[PDB]
Amino acid sequence: IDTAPVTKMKNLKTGTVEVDQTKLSVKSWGHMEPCGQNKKFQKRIKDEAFKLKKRQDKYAKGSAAYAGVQEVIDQAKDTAKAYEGRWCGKKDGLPRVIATGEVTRGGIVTPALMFLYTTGWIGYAGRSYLLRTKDAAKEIKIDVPLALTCMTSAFAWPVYSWQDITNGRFVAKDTEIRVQRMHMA
């Protein structure tokens, strides 16, 4: 006869909320540690290697299947060595993604920038093609030279897009597009 684990609150009657500046970093958090010395992560790596070796033992030495599983084992070892620098909890051992904004191992800022640049490239290439091919024929029938021209020319999307936004050539005036006014606004 017992309840769920009771958590302890802060009876914060002092009238101030203190945020520790030194705790605003992954290295200063007591629930996540680097994967290198995380015992649970090391156990996970050992279990993975043992399972890979057991799978390898099924196939005889020198066979193509043996070589395939051996390459898998080498890939797993290299992946473990790379992940030793990640951050993985203290009880799970699974490497975590830090989405605070700190530029750290396994962070989000660099992947976010790379994705945003790539997809702004995609969207600006498509928009440029639609602007230079204002025709359904050229939409169903891709003008491959012009399409690839737009695709390779959209590399400057972050600056050209902002220039068009600030110069009025990007957005359209609300009085010039098909906007929903059926309520007779």
Partner 1 sequence: AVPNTPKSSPDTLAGNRTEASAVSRPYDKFNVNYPLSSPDQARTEVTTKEIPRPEDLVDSPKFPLFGGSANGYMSKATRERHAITWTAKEETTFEMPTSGWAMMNKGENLCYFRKKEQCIALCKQLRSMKINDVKIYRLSKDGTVTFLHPSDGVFPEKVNKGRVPVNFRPFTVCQNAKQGELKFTEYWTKPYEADALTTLFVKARVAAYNDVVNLFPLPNPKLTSGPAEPTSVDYDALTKEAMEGQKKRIEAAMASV
Partner 2 sequence: AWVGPKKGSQVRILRPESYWFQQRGTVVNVNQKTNIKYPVTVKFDFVNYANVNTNGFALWEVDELKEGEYDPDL
Partner 3 sequence: DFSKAAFGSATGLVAKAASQTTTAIWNLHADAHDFSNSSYLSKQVFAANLAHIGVVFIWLSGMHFHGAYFSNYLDWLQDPSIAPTAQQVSNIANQSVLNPIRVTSGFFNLWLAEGITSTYQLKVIAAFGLIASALCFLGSYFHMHSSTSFTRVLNTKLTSLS
Ligand X SMILES: CCCCCCCCCCCCCCCCCC(=O)OC[C@H](CO[C@@H]1O[C@H](CO[C@H]2O[C@H](CO)[C@H](O)[C@H](O)[C@H]2O)[C@H](O)[C@H](O)[C@H]1O)OC(=O)CCCCCCCCCCCCCCCCC
* Contact footprint for partner 2 (CB under 8 A): 131, 134, 172-173, 175-179, 181-185
- Cα Rg of the chain (Å, integer): 28
Dihedral angle over CA of 121, 126, 129, 134, nearest 10: -150
Q: Can you tell me which of 39, 72, 82, 117 binds ligand CLA, judged by CB under 6 A?
A: 117
Annotate each residue in 57-96 with x if it binds partner 1 (CB under 8 A) or - if it does not, as one string: ----------------------------------------
Residue 124 CB-half CA count within 13 A: 22
Query: How far apart are CB 122 and partner 2 at their closest, in Å?
Result: 20
Where helices occur in 20-63 by DSSP H, the ranges are: 39-58
Distance of alpha carbon 80 from alpha carbon 88, whole angstroms = 12
CB burial class (10 A; 0-12, 13-18, 19+) of residue 80? middle
Three-state SS at 87: strand
Per-residue contact track with partner 1, 163 to 182, x per CB under 8 A? -------------------x
Q: Which residue has the tokens 């068009």?
A: 164
Shortest Cβ distance from residue 11 to ligand CLA (Å)? 23
Q: Can residue 92 be called a binding residue for ligand X (CB under 6 A)?
A: no
Binding status of residue 148 toward ligand X by CB under 6 A:
yes
Separation of alpha carbons 147 and 129, rounded Å: 6
Partner from partner 2, partner 3, ligand X, none binding residue 48, C-beta < 5-8 Å depending on class: none
Quick note: the x/- pattern for ligand X over 103-142, rule CB under 6 A, is ---------------------------------------x
DSSP label of 60: P
Decide: is 45 part of the binding site for ligand CLA (CB under 6 A).
no
Question: Residue with structure tokens 């030495």?
Answer: 61
- Residue 76, contacted partner among ligand CLA, partner 1, partner 2, none, CB below 5-8 A by kind: none
